[PDB]
Amino acid sequence: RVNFSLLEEPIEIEKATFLTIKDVQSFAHLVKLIYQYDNELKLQKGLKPTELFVVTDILGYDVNSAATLKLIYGDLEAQLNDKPEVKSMIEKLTGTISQLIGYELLEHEMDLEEDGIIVQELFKALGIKIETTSDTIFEKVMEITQVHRYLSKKKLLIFINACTYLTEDEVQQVVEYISLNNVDVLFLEQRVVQNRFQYILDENFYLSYEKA
């Protein structure tokens, strides 16, 4: 994954790549570009607006949206498909509940009818979601990265200012996760992230791949 704007040199986003932009205006501008994304070019084949995933507000980000739960539930059912001895138990438990309640409908004085219970119905009845209420920014960053692991239509996650919140070993565990799961993410910072390699465009317009 490749982008270019004012640099006149293409930056390469492979796994977890850090881009620090010292001058606030140029940082405000690249940020504005990222939200207006459509100038600013993302690649070979140009990225579709819909394949970009941007977060600035880590805690406000809704990770339990309707679409994301759909995939999670899809995978949970799959996982449970591969454990026939468990799926089996579940089926017999739900079957029994249905016979049981079935009887009640009969003894009920109106003309009652039922279908049955499939696993998705169970996921929905259980209130299955990602836990977020007790999240630290670190725990949440991780949760956002994993949703990205899943959202295979989302080609690039850009974090903005996310590092201003994390301790240095915290940044390393996020990187280790991104490395290990073959996803690509850009951290866009205005202040240098300590003890690692990063692109830096400095107070003047000198682009370098230094370290801190």
116 binds its own copies (CB under 8 A): yes
- Going by C-alpha positions, the residue among 75, 67, 36 that lies closest to residue 52 is 36
Token code pair at residue 164: 């201003």
Residue 143 assigned ligand-binding role: yes
Q: How far is the CB of 192 from Ca ion (least distance, A)?
A: 29
Amino acid at 191: R
Instruction: Kindly determine how many residues on this chain lie close enough to bind Ca ion according to the rule CB under 5 A.
Output: 7
- Report the run of H or E that residue 120 belongs to, with start and end: helix 119-125
Regarding beta strands 2-4 and 11-12, do their DSSP bridges make them parallel or antiparallel, or are they unpaired?
antiparallel
**Pick from 6, 7, 130, 192: which binds its own copies (CB under 8 A)?**
130
109 binds its own copies (CB under 8 A): yes
Quote the CA–CA distance of 128 and 198 in Å, as a whole number: 38
Residue 125 assigned ligand-binding role: yes
204 binds its own copies (CB under 8 A): no
Show the binding pattern over residues 98-117: x = contacts Ca ion (CB under 5 A), - = does not.
-------------x---xx-
**Pick from 44, 62, 110, 204: which binds its own copies (CB under 8 A)?**
110
b/e 39-70 (16+ beta carbons within 10 angstroms → b): eeebeeeebeeebbbebeebeeeebeeeebbe
25 binds its own copies (CB under 8 A): yes
Show the binding pattern over residues 70-99: x = contacts its own copies (CB under 8 A), - = does not.
--x--xx--xx--x--x--xx--xx-xxx-
Binders of its own copies among residues 55 to 74 (CB under 8 A) are 55-60, 72
Beta-carbon-side half-sphere exposure of residue 73 (alpha carbons within 13 Å) = 19
**Pick from 40, 135, 170, 202: which binds Ca ion (CB under 5 A)?**
135
Instruction: Return the DSSP state at 207.
Output: E
Instruction: Return the DSSP state at 50.
Output: G
The residue (of 119 and 207) whose beta carbon lies closer to its own copies is 119
The residue (of 58 and 200) whose beta carbon lies closer to its own copies is 58
- SS3 at position 188: strand
Residue numbers in the known binding site for Ca(2+) are 111, 115-116, 121, 125, 131, 135, 143
Binding site for Ca ion (CB under 5 A): 111, 115-116, 127, 131, 135, 139
